[PDB]
Amino acid sequence: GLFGAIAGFIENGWQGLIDGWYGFRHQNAEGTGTAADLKSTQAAIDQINGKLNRLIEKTNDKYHQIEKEFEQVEGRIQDLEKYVEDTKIDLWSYNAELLVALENQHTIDVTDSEMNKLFERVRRQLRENAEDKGNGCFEIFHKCDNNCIESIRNGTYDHDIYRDEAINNRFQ
């Protein structure tokens, strides 16, 4: 993708994460955990389902048209009829081919984008209390219990509470 997160600085996905498209995996003094991020997950699902709805249902309600099969050739008039249909099919085949290719290219970019938005959101939360390890992981430079981790995931983390402890660990 364009943002280089999925199949990028995140080396792979998590088969364990089964209740979301994106989430957090942590480790602290008391253990480890994986939890889904709903906002990012929902942001991607909504965008993809939007594509699905624009697609499924447009109006091709056709009744009386033209003959498309022939026993024997008749010449001029039959040639035109066949040529007309053959031209139609190639143009619609082309449209279907390009559409899927475009939609798919975009969908992959959107999902890569949503991964990166999540990473960036969390990066901004942590301020000077954490350092980017380079693999979609932050080293947190202060003791951070389960309530602390949950405060990061639910967006209530207050960096000022830990900043003194964090600055001192980072730089000395």
Partner: protein
């Protein structure tokens, strides 16, 4: 200071391959097929009105051939026409066959209107040995064979009917073609014969041809069928110095013609589907189909490809 928090994304063991602009084989977590490549082995009678012609093609149904009586009064969204339809009458050719067939199918209904034509000295209701409905020599029940007086005399005949109705009328009339010069003089009188059907705007006339033709039906003669549309405010004149297969009436024409015909051998079933192909109905929400270019109703668009997968998930990178 060493707690760690990692941001990530889901993955499955095995995903689906999709195409993009730059890569025709990318693995994504979920995908949705956009090309319907499965059809039903029957045709759905709902919610579209399908009329099964069975043994009659739509031309024979309009003519009133033996065994086409069920098609009388019938209204259809789609007329289903069987490939094993069989000719069951004194037989024929329609010069502009496809155009007549198209007009009848598009019109959508078989609503026949009776009207009686005062033919002069000339007989009526001539029948045949190649057109026998239940055991007994007959003819197209919408047509009327005129034959010779007893005292051999067929005057020039002209009648006229005037359309003051609020709809356009479709008259279907024929012209008989004898094998010999004797057959004509037998049947009756003149040599040559001839028919001239006029409207205000037009005038169509035929002189019968007389020759050795192959043996279909078991006779060497044939009928040539024609049609004339009479708008509200127009008239139709029949002139005959001989050989007219005269009409018993006119068909009613819908102002808006929204119907059509589908030629297939697929049986009609129980399902509900607004989309019918010659291979059977389609029951799908997919935008495209590779089943048949012959498609009628509310249908996906026909395309050449057998599969087009739309990614509904991110790239799949497991472990």
């Amino acid at each position: 200071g060493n707690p760690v928090i990692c941001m990530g994304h889901h993955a499955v063991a095995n995903g689906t391959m999709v195409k993009t602009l730059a890569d025709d084989q990318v693995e994504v977590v979920t995908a949705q097929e956009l090309v319907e490549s499965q059809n039903l082995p029957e045709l759905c009678p709902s919610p579209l009105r399908l009329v099964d012609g069975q043994t009659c093609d739509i031309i024979n149904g309009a003519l009133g051939s033996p065994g086409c009586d069920h098609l009388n009064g019938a209204e259809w969204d789609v007329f289903i026409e069987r490939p094993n339809a069989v000719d069951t009458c004194y037989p024929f050719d329609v010069p502009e066959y496809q155009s007549l067939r198209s007009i009848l199918a598009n019109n959508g209904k078989f609503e026949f209107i009776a009207e009686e034509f005062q033919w002069n000295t000339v007989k009526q209701n001539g029948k045949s040995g190649a057109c026998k409905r239940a055991n007994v020599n007959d003819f197209f029940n919408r047509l009327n064979w005129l034959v010779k007086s007893d005292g051999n005399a067929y005057p020039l005949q002209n009648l006229t009917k005037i359309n003051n109705g609020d709809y356009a009328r479709l008259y279907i009339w024929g012209v008989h073609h004898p094998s010999t010069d004797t057959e004509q003089t037998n049947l009756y009188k003149n040599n040559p014969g001839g028919v001239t059907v006029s409207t205000k705007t037009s005038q169509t006339s035929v002189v019968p041809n007389i020759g050795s033709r192959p043996l279909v039906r078991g006779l060497s003669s044939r009928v040539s069928f024609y049609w004339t549309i009479v708008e509200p405010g127009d008239l139709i004149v029949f002139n005959t110095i001989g050989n007219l297969i005269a009409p018993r009436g006119h068909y009613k024409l819908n102002n808006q013609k929204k119907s059509t015909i589908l030629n297939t051998a697929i049986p009609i079933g129980s399902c509900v589907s607004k989309c019918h192909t010659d291979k059977g109905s389609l029951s799908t929400t997919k935008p495209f189909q590779n089943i048949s270019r012959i498609a009628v109703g509310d249908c996906p668009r026909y395309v050449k490809q057998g599969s087009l997968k739309l990614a509904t998930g991110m790239r799949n990178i497991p472990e």
